[PDB]
């Protein structure tokens, strides 16, 4: 059974968290960190801010509420979240066909037993095939993919020139190009973290705590155990 | 049955809302937001503007009606909406063929019963096959895809130069290139939100409230819980 | 039956209207709109101008007949219209083959009845197969695709320079390049609206009113509920 | 029968006329139009100029014979015309094979009747198969595709510089590049109109009147109902 | 029979003539035309010059023999001509296989008749199969494709600079680049005309008159009915 | 039989001659032509010079032996000649397989005749199959493809600058770039002529006269009937 | 059995560690190394820092805690870690199908033994097939792929100019370009190390010690046995 | 038999010689030619230089041994020579399989004759199959391809500047770029000649004389019959 | 047998030696050559240097040991050598499968002989199949491909500027670009020679003498028979 094979394979929650690329930070004596965590996804990660703060404080850093007097900024946005069924990557044999067959066959388990009436065996076989198809189709091999954008700002003594260049699309024909220049002492680096939570019939509120834990640990480990 | 498998799989409304990319906003003391929400799609989202206003006010911001004295602009356009049937991605076994066969076979359930007249059984089998094909073809696995364009304007102290460059197509041969330059204190950033509402025999007015709720929450969360 | 499945699936008129991209307009106090609606398609949309005017007036704008003293221009052209049959995307099984077979088989419904004469049954079976093929081939699953070009002109205080650049093809060898420069206070943005009207045996005059209604609502909603 | 299915499907003349791109014209008080219509195709469209003149005059414009004092020029060229059979897109089953089989089988309709002589039945079956193949092959599902080039010249007050640049090919090795510059007050825009006339066994003189009517209406509607 | 299907389908001569692109000519009072028609093809079009002259004179123009005092030049070259059999696009079933089988079978039409001697029937069947293969292979579905290059020179008042740039290949390694500059009052535009003559067992001398007629009409119509 | 089909199809010599592109020559009063014909191919075309001279003289030109005082140069090089079997484009069924089978079967034409001895029939069948394979493989469907390079030099009054640029390859690593500049009054244009001679078991000396005739006529017709 | 084949093939832990490219270091007398090891992966490598320190000290270098007075910097980041099952590269035959069949067949090992009751044999066969499918699906051929980024900084006497160029993405439309310039005496080179740990039913904590050992040896060997 | 078909097809030596591109030489009064013929191929062409000298002298030129006072240089290098079997383009049926089968079958030609002993017939059949496979595999359809580089130097009065540019590869990382400039009165042109010698079981010393003859004739004909 | 077919086909050593491109050398009076032959391949060519010296001396040149006073340099490096089996290009039928079958069948040659005991025949058949598979797999159709780099330096009177440009890769991130300029009177040209030695069960020491002979002859023939 494909459904039972999936239910056996992915029987326990499996969470993966992969940073896209490395952000290199010079050794520094800064201890203050300012956190700005946002969530533009349909899923709920409300404890991610507190978990990032706790992980950062575990490394000796101090979380401050004043962005101007903070050596580091951790700007994170839980940008996206998608849910997919991996079984559908197999096309057919995933809509309950084999689940209906296994159960249409089991309906013949009444012919060799008490009642072998043709109408009765047909009815029981049909009901068993329907129940088998329902059980096969109700096995959801769900994978939640989350995409988080991270932007670390480190305060330096070097004058950094920011050149904002926005190309705003304007109706299939034009663009409005906005350009501006600012000067400040802050190097900003970006990165992306991709999280995955896989399980059979997985409901997101079960995967949310571990997802937040791993994401917070990764984002805090960007700073390293200073 | 493929139709019944679909009706079981997608039996409850499933709404997804995914922002395209992250708009980074500096920590600010601005509290005023001006909303400009438009809808150039055939579907109806009349409550989206009010839901965005409520979500923004929940974060401590204040929605104002004067665009000139607003620290933030949320300009949103529900640009597009499409409806498709996902079953049609399977080609055949989606036009009622298998639903006709399941029912043409069930018409033989009269031969082994009261009347086994050849004309009667043929007629009942044909009617049952027609009804099965109709029921299979009437199972619509509908997916509504919505595209919303968001444009956030943040008022700054930096002089921003906007260079409008429109390349208007002119009859398969030419272009009229319009260029202009303006100066103002407003950085404009764009982004795109893709919404999906999936269900069996889904009617849009059922999916509209949750679609608006999720879209409003995402667009407001762009500003973050300031 | 493929024909019957199509007639069941697309039994009621389905109209879609999708704008290509968003035209962003700054908040403004302009209330005057000038409409220029043209139709270079073989289909007839004569009521589109009045419907656009009514939809625009519903938003508080005022439609004027003087292009020079109009804050906004709505220039629309119903550029193209095509009609196709979607069943032909399936290649064969859509020219009446299966509709002929279903009916050639039904011609055997005379052998088991009053007259089983070989000539008579052959003739009735042939006539029934011909009628079945005709009925299958007469089921038209028609989709009208309409392309409209929209050009919104908004009057500004910024000097706008228009550089007309036309590359006129000249006989497989040359081009005449026409260049000119104009100055005026009007930003012109473009966009495209794609309409679809789908039904079984759909005749365009039935789809035209709703097509115009949706197109007018979309084009007027470009301006937003000002 | 594929031939019969085609004869049923495309039983009445179907004419389509699609402009390639939109030519945008500013609102103007010009009322004079000069028409220059040419036909470098093997087909005959002699009434096209008169139909364009009538359609233009219906919009309030006035057709003049002096190109120098005309606000608008409508320069049209019926460049190309091709005729194809769409059945040949199916490869085989379109050269009379199935039409021969349907008729070779019908030749057996003499064995069960008056004369069942082996020579006689063979001869009648062969003749019937030949006639069936001839009738199937004589069913022409013809599509006429016509390509028209349109060049609208609008007289302006802006000085327009035309830079003629012709790259004349010279024997697989060279090019003669002719360049010249002229100055005049006329913006020239181009566009293309594609016409299709589809029917079974369609003869062009039947499709020519409606083809001209639709083409003239489209080209005149370029000017819009001024 | 594929051969019979071809002989029925393309039973009468079909001539097509398609100009590549449009050459736009300004309205002019010139009436003199100078013709220079050449033929570097293996086929013969000797009457093309006279037919072009007649068609041009029918439009009111006057054909002159002095190139210097001619308002228009019509320079045409019948560059290429190819002959192909379209049946060979089907690969096999076009070399006489099926024509041999149809006739090998007909050789059995002697067993059921006067002499059924094994040697006699084998010999007659072999001869009939050979004759059938010969007749099938002797059915030529011929298509003549002709390519003509046209170069129209129109005398203007604008000074036209011709920059001859020839890149003469020199033995797999080098090029001799010849460059020169001339000045004259003549705009030269090019174009290409593709002619097709299709028929079963078509001999070119039958297709030549109509081919010349259509080509001359097209090239003359480049000038338009001035 | 594939061999018989080929021998019937291509039973008479078929010669094609196609110029690559058109060389445009201005109307001129020059009457002197200088011919330089070379042949770097393995085939023999010794009469091509005389045939070109005769064709040129037929047009009123005069062939001269002094290159300096010749208005026109016809420089031709019969660069390449290849011979191929077209039957081998079919892969198998062209090495004698079917020719062996047709003849292995004909060896059974001795069993039903005078001697039906197993050894005798086996020997005769083997010999007949060998002879059939030999006859099939000895059917050569030969196509000679010839490539000629033509270079026409026309004497003008315009100063022509020739920039010789040769990039001589030097051992997989280097190039010696030779550059030089000359000035002379002669425009040189190139072109290519592709000839084909097709027949069954064609020997080149049979195709050479007509090949030369067609090539000479084409190259001379480059000049046109002046 | 595919599961048995996997369990036999990959029965013992196999660890691979491959550096991407070579970092060339000049011969030097520096003996001080500063280590900065971070881990932004979900896996745990806490002993990697100590192992790198031990391996470096084995080569004669001295690990220091002051980054400013260190001749060498070893900056390493265990960026990513993924876990996959290689059996799934075979598609089917890996979800327990063949493991179910091997065991459904073994359930017939009760018919030829003590109890051959149809119900009993069916039940035992079903249970054995379920157990076989479970055992097949419980065989995990796991491969852990770890990606580490290494950045070696070597202190020189040459002035090194660092030009920070960050292109921060801003919402699908814009980029903020940050540019800065610093000067210092430190050449920084990068590289990447890819580690793999393969085994059947491998749990990461078993592979972690050897993974750390190999990674530390490789990163330390970058410095060479100085 | 494929082997016998090949031995029949390519039974006599077939030599082809094709120049790559044309080297155009101006008409000249030079009569002195200097030959430099080299052979860096494994094959032997020792008589090529003498054959080129004889062919050149046949055209009226005079071969000289002083390169400085020679109007023309013919520099030729027989660069490459490869030998291949064309039968191997058919994959199998070319290693002796079918030749083994034809002979394994012929071993049954002893059962119906004097000795039908099972051991004897098996042994004779095996020996015959081995001999047939050996004979089939010993049929070599060999094609020798030769590549010759030709460099013609023509002495002129124009100053020719040679810019030697050699990019010498240096160990997967670098290049040494050598550049030099010389001035001399000699235009050098290149070209390539491809020779083919095809036959069954062809040994090169048989094809060498004709190969040299054709190559010499082509290279000498570059100069033309001056 | 595939193995026997290979052993028959490639029964004698076949050596090919192909130079990549031609190095053109001007006629010169230099007679001194300096040889620098290196071998960075795993194979042994120790006699190549002496063979090159002998071949060069055979042409009249004199081999010198002083690089500074040598008109020519022959710098050669036997860069690479690979050994492959061509039979593996056929995938299966080359690992002994067919060789096992031919021999498993021959094991049945004991049933029809003295002992037909089932155990005895099974054992003898298994042993014969094993021996056949071993003999098939022990037939090695080996091809040695050798790559030699040649660099000819010719001393000139022209000043040659060498621009060394080395781009040394530095750890997946950087490059050290080394540039230098030298001046000397020596043109250096490169080329590549590819050698192949093919035979069944070929051992390199048997192919080495002929490989060296051919390579030396080719490299010496670069200089030509001066």
UniProtKB/TrEMBL annotation, chains A, B, C, D, E, F, G, H, I:
Compartments, record wording = Cell outer membrane
Q: Keywords, A to Z?
A: Cell outer membrane, Conjugation, Lipoprotein, Membrane, Palmitate, Plasmid, Signal
* Chief place of localization: membrane
**Entry GO CC:** cell outer membrane
Q: Where is the signal peptide?
A: none
Q: Which topology term describes how it sits in the membrane?
A: Lipid-anchor
Does DNA-binding show up as a keyword for this record? Answer: no
Function statement: Responsible for preventing unproductive conjugation between bacteria carrying like plasmids.
Name the family the entry cites.
Belongs to the TraT lipoprotein family.
Its protein name is: TraT complement resistance protein
Originating species: Klebsiella pneumoniae
